[PDB]
């Protein structure tokens, strides 16, 4: 989140009226809470799961410009993380097939699974 | 004599109780003879390589794609094979069964399956297209996708990832 | 009895064929039948389900208890979808189409 | 099955390769005292896992009449092979004395084995 907000909300960026909504089931710790407070005017956080359609409806995923899925780069099994990310993509495309998705993939042989989704 | 009925409502069921005409050398079966039985065979006889499975022609069969590890809970696949090996089916009507999955888990569960006539093993991965093409997945009568890794996960909704990925891979 | 034998031996034990076991072999099995080319093909072209049930029960002692029907069978336009859904115990006046499957309990014959 | 055991002792052990040692010498030494004649000694058959008995065999290999059945106390075939209906005593021991979330569930194997033998 620190790196993505550092690049995305850079001062030299041209004036863009875009708000960032972080949807995550795990509640933030103190440092994450402080980081969100430093950008309270442009960044909002909500507790929930992508796999639950109600939580997708809460964050207005049907009107969002794009969905960005970040990967856990430090995990015991990269294949499990890749499968979880692919299933999140499947859920998001099931809710709204016309949304634009940018995802992070750990292993190269797993991204072929993304070709199996019709949407 | 008790009888079992399928009905929309229980009120019409009572009409069946108040109805009167006036108003209106070799062992081929088990000891009980209810299932097909064969002599026990070692697991080495049923394991097929990819090329060997390619040579044999399988059509109208059953493909069981198993997600299992050497340290996972046992599904108990005998309960899946016993209904398919009952004696009310003739021998020629029996459907060949091919278990595609890890060889360690199938070694663990083979000691309850080695008495059934037509069972074969493909030691591969259900997520690999080469194994599914070797077993002629386009000619099978049914593909059963099972996940032995029923262990608890922090998110329960993520327990079905392997099955959904395999289903989409087979459909695509 | 099979439950007790399996509990005792933790395995399935074979045995030689006897007339009692061969008599025990006779049961009924679950099957699906197609009306395209069977003896019920003429009745499957717009006929009623009750006539099919009565004929199957009287002739072959076959118990029909459900229809398995293509999803786009009711649509006028042709479709390439081969998915089918389940109709459990249709009434007597339920109509039939040639592209249907019938759930049935079929007897054993040698 | 070929050998005939009558008036013997059957020790049904619930043990694993990584479980605490019971110390079965303390069970065999009283039964092998010199105040008993050789013909009055009761044959001892340890029915259980072979790994645990391999671990504890190095303190038992000096006693005259001891035999091993590498099976399971919960299997009726093993109990019928050892002639459980003719034994003088059946001793059911659970080496798996590890801590459990509920202590009352630490006796499940022994109770199940006892009911299985009685039935």
UniProtKB/Swiss-Prot annotation, chain C:
Phosphorylated. Phosphorylation by kinases such as PKA and/or PKG. In smooth muscles, phosphorylation affects its activity. Widely expressed. Except in myocytes, it is almost ubiquitously expressed. It is found in: Cell membrane. Potassium channel activated by both membrane depolarization or increase in cytosolic Ca(2+) that mediates export of K(+). It is also activated by the concentration of cytosolic Mg(2+). Its activation dampens the excitatory events that elevate the cytosolic Ca(2+) concentration and/or depolarize the cell membrane. It therefore contributes to repolarization of the membrane potential. Belongs to the potassium channel family. Calcium-activated (TC 1.A.1.3) subfamily. KCa1.1/KCNMA1 sub-subfamily. The S0 segment is essential for the modulation by the accessory beta subunits KCNMB1, KCNMB2, KCNMB3 and KCNMB4. The S4 segment, which is characterized by a series of positively charged amino acids at every third position, is part of the voltage-sensor. The protein was initially thought to contain two functionally distinct parts: The core channel (from the N-terminus to the S9 segment) that mediates the channel activity, and the cytoplasmic tail (from the S9 segment to the C-terminus) that mediates the calcium sensing. The situation is however more complex, since the core channel also contains binding sites for Ca(2+) and Mg(2+). It is linked to Paroxysmal non-kinesigenic dyskinesia 3 with or without generalized epilepsy: An autosomal dominant neurologic disorder characterized by absence seizures, generalized tonic-clonic seizures, paroxysmal nonkinesigenic dyskinesia and involuntary dystonic or choreiform movements. Onset is usually in childhood. Patients may have seizures only, dyskinesia only, or both. Homotetramer; which constitutes the calcium-activated potassium channel. Interacts with RAB11B. Interacts with beta subunits KCNMB1, KCNMB2, KCNMB3 and KCNMB4. Interacts with gamma subunits LRRC26, LRRC38, LRRC52 and LRRC55. Beta and gamma subunits are accessory, and modulate its activity. This is Calcium-activated potassium channel subunit alpha-1. It comes from Homo sapiens (Human). The gene is KCNMA1.
């Amino acid at each position: 989140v620190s790196n993505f907000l550092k690049d995305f909300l850079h001062k030299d960026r041209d004036d863009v009226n875009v708000e960032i909504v972080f949807l995550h089931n795990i509640s933030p710790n103190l440092e994450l809470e402080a980081l969100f407070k430093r950008h309270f005017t442009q960044v909002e956080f909500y507790q929930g799961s992508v796999l639950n359609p109600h939580d997708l409806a809460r964050v207005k995923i049907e009107s969002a410009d794009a969905c960005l899925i970040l990967a856990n780069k430090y995990c015991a099994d990269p294949d499990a993380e890749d499968a979880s990310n692919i299933m999140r993509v499947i859920s998001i495309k099931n809710y709204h097939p016309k949304i634009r998705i940018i995802t992070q993939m750990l292993q190269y042989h797993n991204k072929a699974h993304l070709l199996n989704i019709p949407s | 004599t008790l009888g079992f009925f399928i009905a929309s409502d229980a009120k019409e069921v009572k009409r069946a109780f108040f109805y009167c005409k006036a108003c209106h050398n070799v062992k081929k079966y088990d000891s009980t003879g209810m299932f097909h039985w064969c002599a026990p065979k070692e697991i080495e006889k049923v394991i097929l390589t990819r090329s060997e499975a390619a040579m044999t022609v399988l059509s109208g069969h059953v493909v069981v794609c198993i997600f299992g590890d050497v340290s996972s809970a046992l599904i108990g696949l005998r309960n899946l094979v016993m209904p398919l090996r009952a004696s009310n089916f003739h021998y020629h009507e029996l459907k060949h069964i091919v278990f595609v999955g890890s060889i360690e888990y199938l070694k663990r569960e083979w000691e309850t399956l080695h008495n059934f006539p037509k069972v074969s093993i493909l030691p591969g991965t259900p997520l690999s297209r080469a194994d599914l093409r070797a077993v002629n997945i386009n000619l099978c009568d049914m593909c059963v996708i099972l996940s032995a890794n029923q262990n608890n996960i922090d998110d329960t909704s993520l327990q079905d990832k392997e099955c959904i990925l395999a289903s989409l891979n087979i459909k695509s | 009895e099979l439950e007790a034998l399996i509990a005792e031996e933790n395995a399935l034990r074979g045995g030689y064929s006897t007339p009692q076991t061969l008599a025990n072999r006779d049961r009924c099995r679950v099957a699906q039948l197609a009306l395209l080319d069977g003896p019920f093909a003429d009745l499957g072209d717009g006929g009623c389900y009750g006539d099919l049930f009565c004929k199957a029960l009287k002739t072959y002692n076959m118990l029909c208890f459900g229809i398995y029907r293509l999803r786009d069978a009711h649509l006028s336009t042709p479709s390439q979808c081969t998915k089918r859904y389940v109709i459990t115990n249709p009434p007597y006046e339920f109509e039939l189409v040639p592209t249907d499957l019938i759930f049935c309990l079929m007897q054993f014959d040698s």
